[PDB]
Design a protein around this ligand. Sequence first.
Ligand SMILES: CC(C)(C#Cc1ccc(-c2ccc(Cl)c3c(NS(C)(=O)=O)nn(CC(F)(F)F)c23)c([C@H](Cc2cc(F)cc(F)c2)NC(=O)Cn2nc(C(F)(F)F)c3c2C(F)(F)[C@@H]2C[C@H]32)n1)S(C)(=O)=O
Ligand SMILES: CC(C)(C#Cc1ccc(-c2ccc(Cl)c3c(NS(C)(=O)=O)nn(CC(F)(F)F)c23)c([C@H](Cc2cc(F)cc(F)c2)NC(=O)Cn2nc(C(F)(F)F)c3c2C(F)(F)[C@@H]2C[C@H]32)n1)S(C)(=O)=O
Ligand SMILES: CC(C)(C#Cc1ccc(-c2ccc(Cl)c3c(NS(C)(=O)=O)nn(CC(F)(F)F)c23)c([C@H](Cc2cc(F)cc(F)c2)NC(=O)Cn2nc(C(F)(F)F)c3c2C(F)(F)[C@@H]2C[C@H]32)n1)S(C)(=O)=O
Ligand SMILES: CC(C)(C#Cc1ccc(-c2ccc(Cl)c3c(NS(C)(=O)=O)nn(CC(F)(F)F)c23)c([C@H](Cc2cc(F)cc(F)c2)NC(=O)Cn2nc(C(F)(F)F)c3c2C(F)(F)[C@@H]2C[C@H]32)n1)S(C)(=O)=O
Ligand SMILES: CC(C)(C#Cc1ccc(-c2ccc(Cl)c3c(NS(C)(=O)=O)nn(CC(F)(F)F)c23)c([C@H](Cc2cc(F)cc(F)c2)NC(=O)Cn2nc(C(F)(F)F)c3c2C(F)(F)[C@@H]2C[C@H]32)n1)S(C)(=O)=O
Ligand SMILES: C=C(C)[C@@H]1CC[C@]2(C(=O)O)CC[C@]3(C)[C@H](CC[C@@H]4[C@@]5(C)CC[C@H](OC(=O)CC(C)(C)C(=O)O)C(C)(C)[C@@H]5CC[C@]43C)[C@@H]12
Ligand SMILES: O=P(O)(O)O[C@H]1[C@H](OP(=O)(O)O)[C@H](OP(=O)(O)O)[C@H](OP(=O)(O)O)[C@@H](OP(=O)(O)O)[C@H]1OP(=O)(O)O
Ligand SMILES: O=P(O)(O)O[C@H]1[C@H](OP(=O)(O)O)[C@H](OP(=O)(O)O)[C@H](OP(=O)(O)O)[C@@H](OP(=O)(O)O)[C@H]1OP(=O)(O)O
Lengths: 232, 232, 232, 232, 232
Amino acid sequence: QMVHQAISPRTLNAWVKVVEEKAFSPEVIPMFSALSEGATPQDLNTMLNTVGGHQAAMQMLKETINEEAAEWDRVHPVHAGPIAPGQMREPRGSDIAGTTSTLQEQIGWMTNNPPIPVGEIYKRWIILGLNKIVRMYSPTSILDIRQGPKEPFRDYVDRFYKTLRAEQASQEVKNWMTETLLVQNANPDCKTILKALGPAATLEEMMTACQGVGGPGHKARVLAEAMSQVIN
Amino acid sequence: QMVHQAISPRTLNAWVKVVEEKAFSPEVIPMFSALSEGATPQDLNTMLNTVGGHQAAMQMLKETINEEAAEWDRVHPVHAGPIAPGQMREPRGSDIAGTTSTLQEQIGWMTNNPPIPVGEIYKRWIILGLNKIVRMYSPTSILDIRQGPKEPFRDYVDRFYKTLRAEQASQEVKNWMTETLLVQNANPDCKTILKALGPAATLEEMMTACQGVGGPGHKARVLAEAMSQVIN
Amino acid sequence: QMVHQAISPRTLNAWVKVVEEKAFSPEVIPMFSALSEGATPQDLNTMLNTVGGHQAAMQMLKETINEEAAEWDRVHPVHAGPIAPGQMREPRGSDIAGTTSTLQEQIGWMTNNPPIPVGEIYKRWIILGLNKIVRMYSPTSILDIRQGPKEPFRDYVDRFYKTLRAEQASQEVKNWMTETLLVQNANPDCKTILKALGPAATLEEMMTACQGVGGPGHKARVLAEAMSQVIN
Amino acid sequence: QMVHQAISPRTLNAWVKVVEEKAFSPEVIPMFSALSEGATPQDLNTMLNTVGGHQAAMQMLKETINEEAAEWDRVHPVHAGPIAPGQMREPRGSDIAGTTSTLQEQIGWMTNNPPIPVGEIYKRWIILGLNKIVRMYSPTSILDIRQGPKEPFRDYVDRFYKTLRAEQASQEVKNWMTETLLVQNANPDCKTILKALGPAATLEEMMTACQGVGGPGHKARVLAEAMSQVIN
Amino acid sequence: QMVHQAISPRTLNAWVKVVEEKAFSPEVIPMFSALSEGATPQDLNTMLNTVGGHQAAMQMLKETINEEAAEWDRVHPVHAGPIAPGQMREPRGSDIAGTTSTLQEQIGWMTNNPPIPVGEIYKRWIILGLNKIVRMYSPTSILDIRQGPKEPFRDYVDRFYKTLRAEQASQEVKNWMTETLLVQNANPDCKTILKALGPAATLEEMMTACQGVGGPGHKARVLAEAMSQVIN
Ligand SMILES: CC(C)(C#Cc1ccc(-c2ccc(Cl)c3c(NS(C)(=O)=O)nn(CC(F)(F)F)c23)c([C@H](Cc2cc(F)cc(F)c2)NC(=O)Cn2nc(C(F)(F)F)c3c2C(F)(F)[C@@H]2C[C@H]32)n1)S(C)(=O)=O
Ligand SMILES: CC(C)(C#Cc1ccc(-c2ccc(Cl)c3c(NS(C)(=O)=O)nn(CC(F)(F)F)c23)c([C@H](Cc2cc(F)cc(F)c2)NC(=O)Cn2nc(C(F)(F)F)c3c2C(F)(F)[C@@H]2C[C@H]32)n1)S(C)(=O)=O
Ligand SMILES: CC(C)(C#Cc1ccc(-c2ccc(Cl)c3c(NS(C)(=O)=O)nn(CC(F)(F)F)c23)c([C@H](Cc2cc(F)cc(F)c2)NC(=O)Cn2nc(C(F)(F)F)c3c2C(F)(F)[C@@H]2C[C@H]32)n1)S(C)(=O)=O
Ligand SMILES: CC(C)(C#Cc1ccc(-c2ccc(Cl)c3c(NS(C)(=O)=O)nn(CC(F)(F)F)c23)c([C@H](Cc2cc(F)cc(F)c2)NC(=O)Cn2nc(C(F)(F)F)c3c2C(F)(F)[C@@H]2C[C@H]32)n1)S(C)(=O)=O
Ligand SMILES: CC(C)(C#Cc1ccc(-c2ccc(Cl)c3c(NS(C)(=O)=O)nn(CC(F)(F)F)c23)c([C@H](Cc2cc(F)cc(F)c2)NC(=O)Cn2nc(C(F)(F)F)c3c2C(F)(F)[C@@H]2C[C@H]32)n1)S(C)(=O)=O
Ligand SMILES: C=C(C)[C@@H]1CC[C@]2(C(=O)O)CC[C@]3(C)[C@H](CC[C@@H]4[C@@]5(C)CC[C@H](OC(=O)CC(C)(C)C(=O)O)C(C)(C)[C@@H]5CC[C@]43C)[C@@H]12
Ligand SMILES: O=P(O)(O)O[C@H]1[C@H](OP(=O)(O)O)[C@H](OP(=O)(O)O)[C@H](OP(=O)(O)O)[C@@H](OP(=O)(O)O)[C@H]1OP(=O)(O)O
Ligand SMILES: O=P(O)(O)O[C@H]1[C@H](OP(=O)(O)O)[C@H](OP(=O)(O)O)[C@H](OP(=O)(O)O)[C@@H](OP(=O)(O)O)[C@H]1OP(=O)(O)O
């Protein structure tokens, strides 16, 4: 037969925009519940594959799906023997998840009498994964990258640029983030030097200027400055 | 038969990441060319539907595809007469674009003898559209929203928030953009008042303070201050 | 039969020069796409084996190819039974990647009716790997090796020479890099000592001169110098 | 038969615009590869013939194509002579490039069973040529035409006007280039005289004024001025 | 039959790494002799085609191979008459070089009774070529580009950038090379001006500042300054 509730182009685009705009806020759960209703496991897998970024969250979702597939296998004992020509094989957990089943098999299960709604079962598994992501997963934010009090400026710059590469933004916005947040979120010891350097300093100049922060000479210099302020 | 070069989960995710990270920089043309080789028009349509945002760009792409389909229809004249039972209908432009053709028909055209590579024809049409986008389309940027010299502060705030809603960023990043760019990119007449308000000013207080800029009272007051400087 | 699109000597040399000149900049993706079109998986493997250096990137590419081969195996079920004498075995994921297939088998698949373009499928897998490399892989640079603020000079020298051995350069250029960058990219505490040492100092004398930096005596001496400057 | 992927008017116009806008930046390689897919060698030659200017680059491309045709002829031995009435002659290197083959022969090769993708082979040869151009060819720029320290002003003017005639620009832009760059890019010895002449000076007047630069009289005069400054 | 000593992926990669790391130092001769032993002329040609850069060296090697092939043809007289059906044609010099012989013919010669080791003969020819390269070929070096005493700065800059384009380095290393060596290896007359310009000067500003060096004005000015020092 045919699946009447196969996802339309606008449904897929709406799901993509939901993920891009809201990330994994709780709002994602109702949206996925409504956009994916009636769809085959193949359509749900398409929707899950359209998620860009958030690799850790997607791995969490995959783990949850695998656990639910194991639970399905536990509850449904394997039947051994020759299947009737009219009948078809009973779904397994991987069949529900669509890893070991074709679209035709999923449609056959969904449109059979009695019907096995593999799409809805898989949808509930995905919802469990999404709930776990919403509770547990925290996406990386370039706004959260601050230099530690004893962190070398080079390591902080490396973390900043890694997070910026993972950041969802336009290249112009990422350039503006580099120009604004990197110096601002440095620790006070490095920030003093960076401000003394001037606004026109390049990254190499900034990195050389802070290369000694925490070394013997810089420690002695700041200690002597504080002691001189005290004596005066 | 079956299509061996149907897009895999990783192929679709790579396309999604390419669009999210590069927007419509020229790099999008090779990637789409390489990620979509040998795919059916249905897979191409899926890839196009996973593009979030850039609605004007997608409208441009659709116009280009429609014009290419019209060109195909002009080149291939429709032949009147019943098709042979072992033969299938010759594709029209809409058939290549995937609008009026099913996946089975596309596979039949691609795997026939002689083959009609509808996927590759549609790929070239999409590449023409993408080239037009890369040449002529410029995405909206929150960094580009600046108050006009005579523009009311309300209108500028409205434009800023519309562009922010359209911006591809996390909610925390969007909040930071609101806290940073809105006052910064205001015109000097509003910006002096906004600075006089102080950092703690809310949006409504900021908008009330600038409500009279350009009115008779504000014009008279600034002229009076300037002539106070002059006749000092 | 024969493969009409086997890579020519100039095609292979062009690929080698692309890798040597641009490393894994995005330009590598279109170039590989155009140089390898119509080639057997054996030719693509020949092209991949000519990449000198970038071992981590090539391991990434191999992981991507293995994932795509697993996806192929998942989508193509194994058929058990006696193959027809006029027929050949259906390609598996390793067969497309060329690990478990011979050049004759690849040519037979590519030139059969219906054809299985194993070269094109493998090319898309390699393109996915190259896209991952372009996005995620960053080659080591001798210019990026700087001494940490608390790093011993000997450890920094070891890191510098390891990176220099990995660097793509002529031996004369590498000697010039040793003569220019090693002292330049040392931290301020070691740089002071190295500059006081003189331009004729050897590597052993430089390591001896900086051997005590961060030790108790050096710390006391720099502290005393700072305090003396403060008292005076 | 007929070629389904024959270049459309928009495809050819896009190729022309790509060449006009980007000259031979790396971007030309993907665009060509995308615009020329599935086309006959005749369409490829039409695409190549629309390149205006860059004659040296076109010559390099022709040399690369001839080299690839020679390689093809080396790999494919010439048949004995008994051509089957139902079969057609096997293509040579010149047939792949379309110099000695007609459109009908190219279509026959492309649509035959087994197929010989003469268009794609030729496209690979053209891509090799374009890669050579991108790597090696540098277009002449009016911005780079500067007078040598001992170059006569007449010779520099002649070089400037030759380059300007070769430059891609409108006549008004060329006139503005003449009014701006010619005096600006002269050597200091001629530039001083040109500045002393005044903005209204014509080309003939400037050329007459600089006719003596480097001669014994001008050298003696400039030396005398320098010595007079020294004595005073 | 089959060639048991066909080059493995690691053999080819080792040869590529040898050429990239050692260029044509004498170490290349043993390495090539060891990696290539027992291989067909086709494998030898692959290894030679994987050499990027050093085009003059490769031309020398090709000339040496052609002369050795001529020597082989002189020593082995061509015999007129039909070859025996069980026998194969006797190799010519081009057959040993692999230009006019297919892989099947090479394998047939190497595995015949008595055997003709065309691979070993070709290897000795290549060794002669590599020896000629090691003795007579010196690769271009960016470190060797120095401005002549009265070379115009523009010509020296052109030479520097051509050599830099030919240089085997990463783009970052080439940028650093431009930042360091170009001013450093200018002649003293231009170098004084370049230092007077300052570190922030662009290439166009440097070319304008040195455009007059060697012209009448600059010669008179420097002579006048020297005479000022003398008559001081
Ligand atoms: C052809 C088509 C119709 C299809 C299909 C199709 C079929 C099956 C599956 C699949 C479903 C369920 C399980 Cl439980 C496993 C499994 N279990 S296992 C042995 O432990 O790994 N494997 N698969 C791969 C299988 F089946 F192919 F083997 C699956 C997918 C998933 C959909 C999915 C994506 C996701 F993110 C998280 C999920 F929970 C499920 N997509 C992938 O898995 C590929 N992926 N994975 C991960 C990650 F690791 F981060 F989670 C990532 C991807 C990514 F999308 F690239 C993206 C960056 C993130 N799609 S179409 C048009 O969409 O291409
Ligand atoms: C079921 C499935 C396999 C399928 C399919 C499927 C089938 C056909 C088409 C389609 C293709 C070509 C043309 Cl030429 C037309 C057409 N020509 S017409 C009379 O002028 O409108 N109509 N269609 C709708 C048709 F065919 F249904 F009639 C099409 C699509 C397109 C793919 C596409 C997306 C795109 F962005 C630009 C394109 F050029 C083509 N997607 C849509 O069209 C929906 N869309 N449109 C637009 C816009 F208008 F902005 F461009 C937008 C969307 C959006 F994705 F929401 C996104 C915000 C942007 N997908 S699946 C798993 O992928 O869901
Ligand atoms: C004879 C010939 C025609 C052939 C062939 C030939 C045949 C197969 C393969 C191969 C292809 C695909 C997979 Cl998926 C695996 C696999 N999968 S596995 C079980 O997990 O390891 N193994 N192979 C080895 C196999 F098949 F032989 F078993 C492969 C290769 C690869 C080509 C390749 C190179 C590459 F860099 C990255 C790739 F993704 C694929 N070359 C190698 O792999 C050897 N290599 N590997 C790595 C690394 F580890 F860094 F990635 C490195 C090399 C290196 F080249 F030395 C270089 C330093 C880097 N070539 S010829 C003229 O070319 O000599
Ligand atoms: C009927 C029709 C459909 C056709 C065809 C048609 C057929 C063949 C060829 C051709 C193709 C390949 C080779 Cl390898 C040779 C060859 N090899 S050879 C013995 O060394 O000269 N000769 N030809 C002439 C041949 F075959 F006709 F004899 C060719 C062309 C080329 C296409 C081409 C253009 C190009 F720029 C660079 C190329 F590599 C290939 N166009 C020309 O060559 C004319 N050209 N050449 C050069 C230059 F020298 F600068 F590169 C220039 C032109 C120019 F366009 F004027 C432009 C200023 C530059 N077109 S159409 C479109 O006319 O209506
Ligand atoms: C298909 C395959 C199995 C094969 C083969 C294959 C077959 C033959 C040959 C060949 C061998 C010997 C001679 Cl004596 C001649 C010849 N004699 S002649 C009439 O005077 O020119 N011609 N050939 C071309 C022939 F045979 F096609 F006619 C050859 C090559 C050579 C191998 C080679 C490379 C080399 F550097 C120096 C050599 F001495 C020999 N590679 C080329 O020639 C292409 N090349 N040439 C030169 C240069 F000119 F600089 F030396 C350059 C290249 C380059 F690689 F691009 C690189 C920049 C340098 N490869 S595979 C997988 O490897 O692609
Ligand atoms: C009589 C005078 C008024 C004064 C009073 C005394 C005097 C003084 O102290 O001023 C002693 C120094 C001299 C003699 C001047 C006169 C001028 C000359 C002269 C400027 C002459 C032109 C010559 O130039 C050339 O030959 C051109 C050149 C490029 C070198 C070439 O052709 O190769 C040079 C060599 C540059 C000299 C330098 C010596 C002095 C200053 C004298
Ligand atoms: O007590 P110490 O044995 O002398 O330890 C010191 C000291 O650590 P203490 O807090 O225990 O005193 C310093 O201070 P902390 O950072 O750990 O708070 C620390 O680092 P800093 O000097 O940068 O502050 C480092 O001192 P050093 O920089 O010399 O490594 C360390 O080791 P030392 O014994 O070598 O001084
Ligand atoms: O000074 P240059 O820029 O190099 O050019 C030359 C050159 O001088 P050099 O010795 O430095 O090369 C000539 O040679 P000399 O006599 O000084 O040895 C000299 O005179 P001659 O040409 O007669 O030999 C004179 O050349 P000119 O007669 O043109 O003045 C001079 O100046 P120019 O740069 O103007 O040629």
